[PDB]
Symmetry: D2
Subunit: 445 residues, 4 copies
Amino acid sequence: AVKYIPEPFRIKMVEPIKMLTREERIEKIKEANYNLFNLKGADVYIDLLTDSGTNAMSHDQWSGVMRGDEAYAGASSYFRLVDAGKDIFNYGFIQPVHQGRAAEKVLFPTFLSPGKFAISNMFFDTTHVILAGARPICKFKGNMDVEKMEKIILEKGPENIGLIVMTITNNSAGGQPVSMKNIRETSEICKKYGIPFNIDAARYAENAYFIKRDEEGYQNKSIKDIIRETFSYADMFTMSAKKDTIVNMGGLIGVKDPQSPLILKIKANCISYEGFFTYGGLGGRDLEALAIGLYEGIDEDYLKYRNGQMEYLASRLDDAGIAYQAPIGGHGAFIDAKAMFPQIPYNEYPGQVLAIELYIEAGIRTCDIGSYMLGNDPDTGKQLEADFEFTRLAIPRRVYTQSHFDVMADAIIEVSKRAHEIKRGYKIIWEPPILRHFQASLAPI
Amino acid sequence: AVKYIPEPFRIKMVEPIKMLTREERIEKIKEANYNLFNLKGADVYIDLLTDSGTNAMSHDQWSGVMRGDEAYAGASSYFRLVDAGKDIFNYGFIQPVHQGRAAEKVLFPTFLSPKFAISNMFFDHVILAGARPCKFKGNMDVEKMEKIILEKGPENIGLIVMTITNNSAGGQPVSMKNIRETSEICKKYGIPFNIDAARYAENAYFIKRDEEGYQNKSIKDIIRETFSYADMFTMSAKKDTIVNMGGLIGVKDPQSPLILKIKANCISYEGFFTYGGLGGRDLEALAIGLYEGIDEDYLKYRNGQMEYLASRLDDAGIAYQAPIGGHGAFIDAKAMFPQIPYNEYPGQVLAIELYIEAGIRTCDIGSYMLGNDPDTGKQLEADFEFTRLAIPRRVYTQSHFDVMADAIIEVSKRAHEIKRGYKIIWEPPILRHFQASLAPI
Amino acid sequence: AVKYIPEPFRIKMVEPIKMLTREERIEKIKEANYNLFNLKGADVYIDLLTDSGTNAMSHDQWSGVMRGDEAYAGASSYFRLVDAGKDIFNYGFIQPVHQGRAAEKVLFPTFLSPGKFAISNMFFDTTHVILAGARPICKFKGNMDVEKMEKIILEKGPENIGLIVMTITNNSAGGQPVSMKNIRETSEICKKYGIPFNIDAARYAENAYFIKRDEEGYQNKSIKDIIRETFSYADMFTMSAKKDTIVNMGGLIGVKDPQSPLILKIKANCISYEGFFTYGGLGGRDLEALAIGLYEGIDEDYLKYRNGQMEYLASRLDDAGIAYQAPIGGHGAFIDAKAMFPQIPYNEYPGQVLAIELYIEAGIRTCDIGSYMLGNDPDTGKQLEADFEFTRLAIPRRVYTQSHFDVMADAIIEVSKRAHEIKRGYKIIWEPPILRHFQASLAPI
Amino acid sequence: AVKYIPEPFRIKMVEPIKMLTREERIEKIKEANYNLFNLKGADVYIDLLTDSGTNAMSHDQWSGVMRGDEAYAGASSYFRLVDAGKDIFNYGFIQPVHQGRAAEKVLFPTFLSPKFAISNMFFDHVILAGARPCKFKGNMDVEKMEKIILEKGPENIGLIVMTITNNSAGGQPVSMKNIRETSEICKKYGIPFNIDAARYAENAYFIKRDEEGYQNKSIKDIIRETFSYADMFTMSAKKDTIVNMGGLIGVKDPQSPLILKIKANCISYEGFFTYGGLGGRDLEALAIGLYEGIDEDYLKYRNGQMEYLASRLDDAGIAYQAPIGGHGAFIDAKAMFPQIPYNEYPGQVLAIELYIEAGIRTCDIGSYMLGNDPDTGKQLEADFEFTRLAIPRRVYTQSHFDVMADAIIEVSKRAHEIKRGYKIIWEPPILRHFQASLAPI
Ligand SMILES: Cc1ncc(COP(=O)(O)O)c(/C=N/C(CO)(CO)CO)c1O
Ligand SMILES: Cc1ncc(COP(=O)(O)O)c(/C=N/C(CO)(CO)CO)c1O
Ligand SMILES: Cc1ncc(COP(=O)(O)O)c(C=O)c1O
Ligand SMILES: Cc1ncc(COP(=O)(O)O)c(C=O)c1O
Ligand SMILES: [Cl-]
Ligand SMILES: [Cl-]
Ligand SMILES: [Cl-]
Ligand SMILES: [Cl-]
């Protein structure tokens, strides 16, 4: 096995959880129509459904919550945020926004005229985007296939590609990172063919660690700098802060160039969608927690602990013989449901079978990243077959302990030991035509 | 001669304000290009930009903040907020959203196919039909509305929206009868009826205070009645729910098929529909604030703030937009600066002078605000020139209100000494009033 | 009339209050046996029962509440407190304690050997103390009769007087202050006859203002200094922080001399009564609110507002013809109950008649500072006759508005207009032998 | 081979700790005169001085903090706390106080006329009669107690006090039978019986875990039973009620005349009896914490922390004070440093070495603590040499516990390389261990 990294903090406030029996948990998931999204938080012991804005802040951040300035125009709480923003990244301009998705709505359009296409390093997407994720063909997976991109900027005109977005770490692979090298190289093609380069930075901090730890020549290099370097190869960044700023709400747009015409556009855009640009849909409370949490997320001791959780969980899973995305990513594990349940074909949803079944085991709450989540064909209506059947364990930051990770690994191993008994997957009782998996009702066969 | 109504509460926590030199303040505004929006809030004493999202909460709301469930799906806080809304409004479906903008963004798409909406608002595919401005001056001109419906053809009227209180008119309330009569014309033509409900409680008190035969009904019943006439409502919670973040959609009929579109629209625009862009803390604060903002003792106090201020303005013969609305005061800036023509911005001079005289931040609701012509760029001549004093809830005391009245009278007295207003130096193409740069002549 | 001084702050959190009818308030006070101390806070609209620890803090103080260090030995929250303490007063040593009464228990004994007597500037007392309060014989009332004291240090031996305590402002007079001059002069006799001088400093800040405002030659002098001067004429101070540090809990002992042998004694004493001397019975939360609130209480803008409340209330009362302690004190007004109810003799308690009757009027809660509070003779058992019948309005800091002060003045004037109708006072149904007024039950005649 | 019990809760707020260099830490302790009490808490990683008042509260407790009534008389918070106590303990009277010291100061005067008290404690007009130290080792030696009562004469025994858990023995629990048997001897001689109840819930779980025929009873019932055998109780709330401030007196019989003395004693020593030296925030936190600290899921977890730690100590053959108590670990320091004689303080060397090895603050419970003779001044030879690891509640994780075990094993392994302990340089006359100054030889 491997050793866990003990928390470079101590616990100051706890949220008590009601403990259920398995017979109770069975009733819960049956009452939710076997859709884990219909469970009540109160009935979930370890909630791994997402790492987005479910983190535990510090008593420093809560301190700033009480000091939060709620002024419409010009809150003091706003400058402390932009001052951090300009420090950490060294960008010229920083703009608060309420959600990660709202950062894109504010910025992307100015450069992305309807009809222009942009390439990213992703595998899945909700979207006119061109996906050139480097084939896993393991280390630093989730790079951009710089070759593929470079040729895509020619099969599709150069003055046509609206922009390139490198999201770091790459979510759609499992949180795998991006090499300082894959960033210079993606940068290079961007300056030649004149395309703007944006970094989607939701898990930028976990990414910097993965560089310090793995990319050759960043061993003794400062985390603070490994960040500030990544944001030299980019014209701009958009961010969901709910991730690596260990916060509960917020998003951030930054443009390196202080004089970049985008700035006057972003302010006007923000005023229209979010509100006056010195709170950007964000509260004084949240601006404070976000200017402080920007730095907690960077601290190298916290980054080592956090990487170590993942390492610990992966070691433990190696050791029991369970299949997961081999180089485990920044923020959690992806269990291969089709491997544990070869009896369940894709259309019976092996992902939900594991997810449902892990909840029944220890009140852990996961979600299918597989055929259930993929949905039905937008035109044919027919159920799509996913490349992989994963169930995802997304880990909110600074909230679960080693003891909970043992609750997770162990619950996984228990379903393995009895997987052979579930002879049938699930079937869909009712579903809307769109965002199916959020809403649908299922039953067993 | 009106007397202030004492706060039904005591102060529990304080935000200290650094007091500035009248000398010191002038540098602070010159330094900020004579545009109030550039002032740092720390250099503002009475800050009256908006009543949106600047309210003081209660300790009950804050113990809410500490208990807030941050779960992505199924949080405790969401179910509390849902119950509060179902109970107050007697609707079958209440959707939490992050802003009043988000609630319109999510709800209106369904029926507003690129078709008109008719609104009782007075400025802004919207058609306006507020009555010509006496009580209940936010009322919608029902005769004119029916005229429009037929002139466009019912087909082409997608929804009808009544804003209560009618902000565009100063916070002038809408009669319970006006709603009932608007509802009946919607039903006649098969047109959905939505209430814009940001200041529904101030409107509820106004009905109680002035509509015949409601003197005796409770705010609970008054609110339940006014929403029974509608199909749905959208609202920025940042006003009468006494919070700093929130929006809220309600659909009356529990089986309406509109609900699945709302849920789908929300999942995609804001996030999963059990948080809808809000956090644990804010859904908590919101579920408690819903009831605080409609308390009968609070609303009598809230309306008292406003009666008092107006009473003082009347004692000095100051011309304001009368009767005073539910949430602030609009000072006739042209009434007080005739020497100041529209294109030199009488509303922006009075708002600078109030921040010189007493550290009160206000804004212009006049020529300056409304900027140039879409295609000409020549300064538009606003129909009215005002300076808006927008009062956050439970934040300021009778004393602070006296500072306000005092500053208006004093500026009044020396208004004849200013004979020339201001002039945009720098300006963006759109939205200038927020971020333009001014200077005097 | 006079103008009120508007708050140099704005309201950030409110505590809602349930509003009662007079018929409801009548039921409350009857159910409490006409003892105002038996009322429930929830049934009191404006609670003037004390200004001790009922103040409203700032969002700065609450900010520090969340950052509070709860370490037993050596909390960071303790040094920020002593650092303020040594700044404001310039004393060498500062020691946190839980209550104002606990500061005395910790310090006084070391110097006050059983049998030695000490003189103060007080009128009443719970106590072997000698009281030499300057006869009102109005301005700067509540000085020490330096003459009387000086002769008391001779009728009672000089090497016998354990210490002199000048409490500022003087509570027992009504919050009237102490002149920088009365402090030098009381200091002088203390250095000659070798007696230690302690300042009881519960309302030191209100006192400094009264000096800046009234004592000749302190007009243009800094509040920060007018404090630091007062604590040059003293060997030590004890303090209930619940007063002019705008806090909810805490007490403070300070000794000017850094090398003063008392220090090693105070630490040992504190360890025995309160706990380890780096929290002194105080919580990390409370140490933070107290190090920040030390400075809010000093701010000259807050001191002008606060003095102005009192001035405003007194002006208004002058104007209606109501009798109160003429030079109104730092922290509230004392209404002369015997003057409004000449029908009620002392033994029928005019104080409680007004107090009860003001509650019935507007849910204001006061207390008798008169014959009811004085109690019965410790030996004879017979009801004592007080010098004055006051009912006290003690004003917590930064919690009530001008509108509430109008609620107070006006409720007073209403009982005046109908005082002639109460033909009889109250009688005691049951009382314990000690601290009578806190506990006793009354009825009307 | 024991497995930790996972926390019945998730972390909601964090206190970050600056990690120090083993090099850096040595300066920090030398700089602090080799006395752990001088270390600044910011330079401590795992801080195990006391479990008194260092516990982590819950968000429910903190929303309590925000709602706390600060009224001088009749505060909401007081009535909540009173109800909690009446309900948990089934007593007629519950008096809030600020500390466990304050509760004894207020209650004991009445009967303890300058007369003896008999206690089951093992160190300290107190007479001790704990059994000679197997389970329930905090038990009171009932036979010896009755011997004493008669040897002094009942007249001269003023009250009898059972401490649960028996701190002086390491947190060793007291049997429900031991209480029942002590109660019966009190009743026989007309002697008041008081429970010292600081760790009553850890004791309740121990009874459930080990006393025959309680495996099936609930903690609610177990606690109600153990207090039914007593007349009154005093307690520091800072331990098993999972708060940072508080004490609490209870009197069983609702009509007892003792109550008016308590109220009078309190009004005079602490303050009016509806706050009793506590504030709004702390009475709130206390009323919620009462129930949290006795939850059955929590107590199984709490006891698991301790079973785990001991299990690790046993895997390495580390000698600790066994069986492990409810609230921490006492490491036999003389067992680990024989080369270290009592007067060179083996407990103070192990506690320095643990803070060198891993930033764990512990303290000596041995010669160093117990200081010189009242009249001689020569170093007393403690009966036992220990180092106390006192575990605050809901603050540390299995990982942190592994740091602790790891640091003890490592120090163990290199203990033979230290052949000479420490030597008081400076010292006060009383209480030296807290504030003395040490150095090595
Ligand atoms: C009825 C109503 N509905 C929605 C809004 C927008 O508020 P929000 O989207 O929550 O930031 C407003 C804001 N209106 C103002 C002040 O009135 C703009 O003048 C908010 O800045 C409103 O009055
Ligand atoms: C049963 C009991 N009762 C009262 C106390 C004193 O705690 P307190 O007066 O609330 O500060 C203690 C403290 N005992 C210590 C740690 O055990 C001293 O060793 C608190 O520092 C106690 O164990
Ligand atoms: C799980 C999850 N939720 C939400 C989002 C969108 O971010 P935000 O919630 O900040 O809009 C993302 C993508 O970044 C995500 O991965
Ligand atoms: C009303 C009042 N309560 C209490 C006290 C005692 O102070 P503390 O509450 O800090 O012990 C005093 C005296 O200073 C007082 O005047
Ligand atoms: Cl805001
Ligand atoms: Cl969230
Ligand atoms: Cl503490
Ligand atoms: Cl208090």
